Amino acid sequence: SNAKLDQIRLYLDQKGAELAIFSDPVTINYLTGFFCDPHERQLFLFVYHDLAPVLFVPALEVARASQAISFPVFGYVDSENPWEKIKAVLPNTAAKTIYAEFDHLNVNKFHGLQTIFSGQFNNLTPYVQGM
Numbered sequence: 001s002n003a004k005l006d007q008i009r010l011y012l013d014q015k016g017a018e019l020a021i022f023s024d025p026v027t028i029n030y031l032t033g034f035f036c037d038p039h040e041r042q043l044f045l046f047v048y049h050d051l052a053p054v055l056f057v058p059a060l061e062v063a064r065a066s067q068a069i070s071f072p073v074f075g076y077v078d079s080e081n082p083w084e085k086i087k088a089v090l091p092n093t094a095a096k097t098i099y100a101e102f103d104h105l106n107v108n109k110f111h112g113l114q115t116i117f118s119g120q121f122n123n124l125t126p127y128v129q130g131m
């Protein structure tokens, strides 16, 4: 397992949360060693407290991501709705308590994620700042 993601999973367990969703390319590179500029496209790292983590990227990034990342990586092409695709590829969307990076995630992305996850969202930025 990824040592830094082991620390996130402990944090989630200590907070009684089931899922962290990272969106900031800088945090994602900190955690995984993959750096992305997604432009207008979607980029998320889903760190379940128990399941394998999942990287979600534009299709054009899959090959590069896969060179550095051994856990699941899924892409979406431009003709696909990214929110429907996340729903289609993730093992589980039932988390009751979710952490996300409120200092990076824009309101449109936040609302997008809320069409998939009905759980309560909490701010991850205190954890991120403290690494």
Ligand SMILES: [Cl-]
Residues within 6 Å of the ligand: 001, 002, 005, 006, 053, 071
């Ligand atoms: Cl891992």
